[PDB]
Design a protein around this ligand. Structure first.
Ligand SMILES: CC(=O)N[C@@H]1[C@@H](O)[C@H](O[C@H]2O[C@H](CO)[C@H](O)[C@H](O[C@]3(C(=O)O)C[C@H](O)[C@@H](NC(C)=O)[C@H]([C@H](O)[C@H](O)CO)O3)[C@H]2O)[C@@H](CO)O[C@H]1O
Ligand SMILES: CC(=O)N[C@@H]1[C@@H](O)[C@H](O[C@H]2O[C@H](CO)[C@H](O)[C@H](O[C@]3(C(=O)O)C[C@H](O)[C@@H](NC(C)=O)[C@H]([C@H](O)[C@H](O)CO)O3)[C@H]2O)[C@@H](CO)O[C@H]1O
Ligand SMILES: CC(=O)N[C@@H]1[C@@H](O)[C@H](O[C@H]2O[C@H](CO)[C@H](O)[C@H](O[C@]3(C(=O)O)C[C@H](O)[C@@H](NC(C)=O)[C@H]([C@H](O)[C@H](O)CO)O3)[C@H]2O)[C@@H](CO)O[C@H]1O
Lengths: 559, 559, 51, 51, 50, 51, 50
């Protein structure tokens, strides 16, 4: 009937439909279809692999001050692979992003449905040829089966591939492959903190520990998920997940604490277009300040409703039973000081499937730094300063804490590095989405109390995230099989299957209420311009590259 | 059920049925079925290829006066192919054309339906043999799929293959192949205008430009059209398109401005069968002229209702941002002066599949010039002349502009080359259809204002043309697949599928109201005669050739 | 737009039927009395038609 | 073309998409009233002989 | 307008580049209140003709 | 610009955004039939040719 | 423009390098339709356009 080896079991669809409903509401249905190549897992055994870089040379951790190069950890390798499509690029052409960024004001996730169809399992056999160049013959194993599993209850560790740039390809006309599923296993880890200037005798402590029951969790796809065997004429459907999340603003802010509330009244209008204006003498000016040692009001001392943005500790390498880790920083404006780390700039490394120029030769991955489009909550560390109360303006070298001031006698250490101004008045924008190398949705942390936002994704499922899709090829055993033997002779076998996903979004057209024209994301023909259309056009050899596009181009009033 | 690998999925039908309805109305249903051979695209990557002939020798564009040899342009190569059947020969036997031309007076398009059935995908493997002559083994990939797409909304650039003679074959018993789909990409192009006699120092400007955003459009079948995967036991149907077009006259005109209205009254009847007749003295003759300097009426000076035909600029090579181009000319009568270019004669070059004698050896294509059957709107440039008002008959060398008169001192340049007599009184016939190497229907140009007719096709869809059918073979990946690698090792794979189309026409039988017998399209046995039946008969070796047939053989009164 | 238009003068075109004066849209001879340039219609008639 | 009495006006056609002209005036009493249209797939905008 | 092209489309945008026909300063009021509205581009998106 | 002093009015030239129907007069050329490529000084009407 | 109307000429082979151009079939052997008969070749410029 419906099932048949010669009949197709699905339809390739990769088009973004826009349905305008009304009052400016837009239903954005993004269809994505990709061809996936799956191969036999090198081993059919779950493995507890330990990675430990104790080299006493190079980027090892027995080198004084290489604490940051720590890559030590334990992981459970699984013969299963993961079909992850959680990245903006897998759902939208560069043009689609531009239209949404330039015309819409808000965007929210709606529903997600995924389907696996047209499964083809093939076996490789080698025939002897002259010159001893054995040719490889590819035959169809019509009876072969591909194992598919969906973890809807989300019982297995969540692993967003976007972070490892291992999501499906961003080019619909290119074949893709799933990512080997793997999850960390708790392993005691302790690394001493040293410096390139530490005493030669200083002994570094790089130690790993044996598994601890209190924290040992081993999961197997087979003993946790229902597995569906898929033969050539078989299809898989994941149903329709419903996203319960908070809408994302497609607009940026610009108002700092110095742009909040009624401005000071100018005495008289400027005389010439090249002339400035004068305010009332600070001593005679009316207003409110939180510094009493002074009997004047200055725009800088003016009391503001709250704090737009906040200072964040720099390179706070905290350390637990799992070793040292860079504490994440809310992505904000690098400001005119280009203080990326102080504002949490995101630098990501990706490969050809994710936008690296196909022409680019060499293993070196493509590296791009994402600076927040926001211009309101950033912190220019070089300009920040702390004064002593009772406030004395102008202060003396001993009445102000400028950045250059060394802390603990460390010349390059400044209070800014250890200063946290987060408080009940701190108000900051939420992380900007990053097309096309950006995770869309994310799972919430099962802690009785949770973080206000995630630095990796603009959307956090408020309940349970979409289930992870797991795929693997079953052992193709040969005539010789000893169940009591570890070795398992198996027939070389590979499989190709089509994946189709439908992601739906609820967006709203932006309002236009400003006299001045608004900044819009546009391409140009200027030579050597980040937006030269040539970049988003195919090359003569067909090479394609997708450099990150700007987001939130339209500004919105904060207060 | 209905789907099965061993069951056929369609029926081969290639017969023209004639259904006579009444009042002389005829429903002509043309069935066409062909076997198509599709192979793997040399590349699976869309490519922006640039063609630029800057050779300083031969037919290059750095040669003074080779401006016309310009073949420079940019095109987006697509791994997709196109099943185009828009040519008269693909729908009618030579006999069918003759019957319609000789018996019908009008013809209009009705509906079109297309179907793809009996898909067979096969893989090629090579087995080592003695003499090192590896034999090629052809196996069936039952699970393999062929990608089919239909662009009904006509979002992708329209590419009539008939112009490149790349439509399906005109012989139903011969296998055929689709045409690689490709579309031009805007590219700045400027070429200097020079002459073989230009100064040796004259520097020719042959320059190409980088892509311009204002005019850059890159489309991909995958991100624009829904794609149907077709397996051996799968069928595709395009539904039934309805043609909204204007009927085509199957009759030619003969009345020039000198044959419009009541002729001059003869004084007396001719005395002998070999005698001519005399009219009243032009001075005493009654009538109306638009020349007042004369007090006589002559058949040539007689005022006529309008202008049958019009003079058209010759070789008007206009030039835009895309380089120079020959301005098209409404196909009219070459007249007894055989002024082809002056009347837009269409010379087409075709190959064996389109009527070139199969016996003809050599790459040289078959070249035929189509002269309009019309005998009324043509212009004999050699006879045309312009006189000075007040009209002086007979005029002097300085009172008449004869053709031989050189323009701008150029000996071979004549006013006729730069003369356009198109006006509100110009009345011309519409382009004649050209069996069998002629495009039938055509898409209208999306310009706010459009051309009165297209010189390439007798029928222009007044809304949206039939959707283009796109077909391609999916990458047959092997065991070795690196998604991060540009190279994609693939299994040699080819596919054969049957195409069936049904084109319906509404025609009307011609009336017979003339005493004299009417000219009809007929064959003869005269040796070396363009209509020797031998031409349309198979050769001993089976070689077949279809030379163009005459159309509109019956004349109709214009006024 | 353009009120009126210039029209070729005495464009004697020629087909398989011999030469013929191309007709001209009748317009204003203007103060230059350019009859042919504006297609003035000169007609010859007999007693039955007003002679 | 070196013809003394030949002027660009004789070979100049300014008819275009912006050309706007009035229709032929009726001519009592020596004027044709109605006229037959030309059986050409495409026809003239007006006839110079009849209103 | 529909969006069906892979390549990003040309859009009318302002900039902060000095002496640029689209410097936002032009469409912003002056200190003395002087205002000027230089002509804006139209039909920025291309469409396939045939 | 309200600042602009002097009676002289503001003058702007509007070029059509279109890039398809324009005509580059310098590149346009007319050749003589029967077409002869490459042509001679007397077989082509280049723009520089005086009228 | 008229030079961008209809199916483009078929390239013999794909360009070898990103900086390489492509070649078409010899104008004399190329298939197509022109309105100039004195010539026995088809060139993109002489190609008949709608
Ligand atoms: C000019 C100055 O004052 N300081 C520059 C500084 O900007 C530069 O940092 C980046 O900018 C350069 C500009 O050419 C270059 O982009 C650097 O490296 C690359 C990279 O990381 O590989 C080059 C890549 O080609 C580029 N990506 C693409 C596809 O264009 C990336 C990417 O643009 C960048 O990561 C975005 O932040 O940048 C950048 O690091 C550094 C370089 O040492 O110092 C001065 O040159
Ligand atoms: C005789 C005279 O005064 N002038 C001829 C002139 O007619 C001729 O042009 C054509 O006619 C010749 C007649 O033999 C010949 O047909 C030319 O070339 C071919 C061609 O283009 O290849 C020959 C082909 O065999 C023929 N096609 C077939 C299948 O019959 C085509 C076709 O008939 C022609 O294109 C229709 O116009 O013609 C014609 O060009 C030229 C030749 O230089 O000059 C005198 O010979
Ligand atoms: C540079 C070159 O090769 N040739 C230039 C040529 O472009 C220039 O023509 C115009 O461009 C100049 C550039 O500064 C200037 O814009 C000319 O005149 C003005 C005008 O008409 O008054 C100046 C005005 O300020 C400007 N309007 C505003 C408010 O910006 C107008 C307007 O931009 C222009 O009319 C648009 O076409 O232009 C332009 O005529 C001429 C000048 O003689 O020659 C070279 O300088």
């Amino acid at each position: 009937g419906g099932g048949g080896i010669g009949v197709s079991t699905g339809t390739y669809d990769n088009q973004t439909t826009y349905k305008f409903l009304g009052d400016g509401w837009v239903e954005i249905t993004a269809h994505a279809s990709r061809l996936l190549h799956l191969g036999m897992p090198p081993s059919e055994n779950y493995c507890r692999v330990t990675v430990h870089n104790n080299q006493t040379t190079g980027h090892g951790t027995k080198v004084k001050g290489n604490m940051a190069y720590d890559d030590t950890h334990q992981q459970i390798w699984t013969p299963w692979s993961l079909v992850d499509a959680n990245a903006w690029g897998v759902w939208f052409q560069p043009s689609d992003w531009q239209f949404i960024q330039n015309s819409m004001e808000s965007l929210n996730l709606d529903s997600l449905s995924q389907e696996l169809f047209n499964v083809v399992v093939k076996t490789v056999t080698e025939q002897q040829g002259a010159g001893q160049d054995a040719i490889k013959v590819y035959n169809n194993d019509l009876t072969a089966c591909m194992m598919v599993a969906l973890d809807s209850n989300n019982i297995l560790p969540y692993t967003p591939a976007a972070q490892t740039s291992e999501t499906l390809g961003f080019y619909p006309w290119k074949p893709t492959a799933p990512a080997p599923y793997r999850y960390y296993f708790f392993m005691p880890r302790q690394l001493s903190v040293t410096s390139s200037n530490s005493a030669e005798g200083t002994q570094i402590t790089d130690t790993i520990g044996e598994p601890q029951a209190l924290n040992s969790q081993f999961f197997t796809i087979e003993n946790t998920l229902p597995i569906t065997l898929l033969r050539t004429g078989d299809e898989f459907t994941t149903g329709t997940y419903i996203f319960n999340t908070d809408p994302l603003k497609l607009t940026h802010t610009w108002q700092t604490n110095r742009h909040l509330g009624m401005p000071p009244r100018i005495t008289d209008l400027p005389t010439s277009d090249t002339a400035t204006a004068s305010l009332t003498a600070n001593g005679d000016r009316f207003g409110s300040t939180q510094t009493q040692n002074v009997n004047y009001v200055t725009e800088a001392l003016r009391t503001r409703p709250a704090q737009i943005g906040f200072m964040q500790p720099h390179d706070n390498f905290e350390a637990n039973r799992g070793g040292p880790f860079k504490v994440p920083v809310v992505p904000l404006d690098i400001t005119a000081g280009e203080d990326h780390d102080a504002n949490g700039a995101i630098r990501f490394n990706y490969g050809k499937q994710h936008g690296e120029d196909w022409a680019k030769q060499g293993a070196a991955p493509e590296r791009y730094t994402w600076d927040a489009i926001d211009s309101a909550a950033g912190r220019d560390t070089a300009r920040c300063f702390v004064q002593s109360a009772p406030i004395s303006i102008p202060p003396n070298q001993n009445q102000i804490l400028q950045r250059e001031d060394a802390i603990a006698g460390r010349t390059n250490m400044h209070y800014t590095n250890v200063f946290n101004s987060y408080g009940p008045l701190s108000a900051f924008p939420h992380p900007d989405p990053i097309y096309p190398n950006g995770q869309i949705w994310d799972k919430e942390l099962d802690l009785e109390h949770k973080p206000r936002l995630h630095v990796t994704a603009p959307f956090v499922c408020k309940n349970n995230p979409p289930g992870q899709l797991f795929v693997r090829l079953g052992p193709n055993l040969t005539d010789q099989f000893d169940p009591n033997s570890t070795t398992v002779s198996r027939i070389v076998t590979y499989s190709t299957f089509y994946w189709k996903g439908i992601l739906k979004f609820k967006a709203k057209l932006r309002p236009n209420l400003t006299w001045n024209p608004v900044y819009q994301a546009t391409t140009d023909s200027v030579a050597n311009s980040y937006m030269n259309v040539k970049k988003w056009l195919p090359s003569a050899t067909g090479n394609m590259h997708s450099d990150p596009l700007i987001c939130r181009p339209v500004p919105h009033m904060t207060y």
